[PDB]
């Protein structure tokens, strides 16, 4: 069980990510949380980090997400910035660089981020009085 | 990985449970799915079975849920019927009668049932072509 400041940086990013919806946030990610057994909390971390990396890599220049207006475009840029911030945190927490992602249900990025936010705050609670 | 007909009975109950909201469905259950590591799919099952048992036992005669009208009362009865149906299925699948439930985030029964529905259909997918 790690109780590093890193957890607060994860939660902070999740709070700017979920309050801001874009064109892209309703696209999909493998629902790593549709398993009937997440295994090892560092494996969970590797698992969320791996799926956020797949997302941002493939949607960074996705015509469906870039936007038309400067507002839309700016939001998009911020979405990509935050996913990379969050990923690097996740990877740093995992300290594991290879894990197996085998689920098939997909969820929107939006649901996925909200779930993760929830386990991140549970983690936080088990850490503090 | 079990692929028993039981899974369809679990999904069937979940489908009548989630389409029917009552006075009680917005009350809480320990979010067994706020862990950063569900362990063993039979443990997961034991875990959901244990928390649904706690719910129905304590809310069966909950004045907040019994209802005023015959409609409300009837719905309530059906909610309790289905939770017991689902629990017995879960327990039957677990084949494990003691597991540790240690999370602290709570979710409404409604969110909890929707999540479980999702892992139950993932289970179903990994079972069929």
From Swiss-Prot, chains A, B:
Among the GO biological process terms of this entry, one is: positive regulation of T-helper 2 cell cytokine production
Residues carrying sugar: 38
Question: Which keywords annotate this record?
Answer: B-cell activation, Cytokine, Disulfide bond, Glycoprotein, Growth factor, Secreted, Signal
State its location(s): Secreted
In which broad location class does this protein mainly occur, judging by the first location in its UniProt entry? secreted
GO molecular-function annotation terms? cytokine activity; growth factor activity; interleukin-4 receptor binding
**Cellular-component GO terms for this entry:** extracellular region; extracellular space
Q: Which cysteines are joined by disulfide bonds?
A: 3-127, 24-65, 46-99
Q: Which family does it belong to?
A: Belongs to the IL-4/IL-13 family.
Which protein are we looking at?
A: Interleukin-4
Annotated source species: Homo sapiens (Human)
Q: Which residues of the full protein are shown?
A: 25 to 153 of 153
